[PDB]
Chain length 102, copies 2
């Protein structure tokens, strides 16, 4: 299977311009990261559907502003993948990554 | 002026295979990072001479193993540049970045 991560992101300030995800494979292989743009919105906020052409069990993610102008939570965080799928919700300034809608 | 950073790195375990620097412009502009390989050694350890074709006052640096397999100190660290030059010394597991030989 390939991997599909749906990421929901909400900013309390409502100012999303330039915010994007950096995501990199962590397991079973650690690889370079790439930037992914939000392509949609729902009632929670912005939505990105990230597809990687490999079977992963874990990725890293950092929400950054432009090319590392800033980060929304500075430390590396991770997303667990089961059956080539994951879906998470992320809130501005909140370290915890949620696997259901808050 | 362009920017020249000389980085000295020492590992107490002596096992340098796969260790490289990730470095990205931070000031006056934040840009994507790149990986740089050590090209030499001295009595302290490995040596990299990193040239960027722009005038920078600050860069980020992370010492990583392969493609983010691991980091030697996980958090973002930074190097201050004066007159397009800097030279630092970095020790395995030690957060502080030194601007003279320890």
């Amino acid at each position: 299977t390939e991997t599909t991560i749906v990421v929901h992101y909400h900013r309390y300030d409502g100012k999303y311009d330039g915010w994007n995800l950096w995501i990199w494979p962590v397991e079973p292989v650690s690889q370079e990261g790439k930037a992914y743009q939000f392509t949609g919105e729902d009632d929670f906020g912005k939505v990105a559907v990230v597809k990687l052409p490999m079977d992963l069990t874990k990725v890293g993610i950092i929400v950054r502003l432009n090319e590392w102008q800033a980060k929304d939570v500075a430390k590396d965080r991770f997303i667990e993948i089961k059956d080539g799928k994951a879906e998470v919700w992320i809130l501005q300034g909140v370290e915890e990554i949620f696997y259901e809608k808050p």
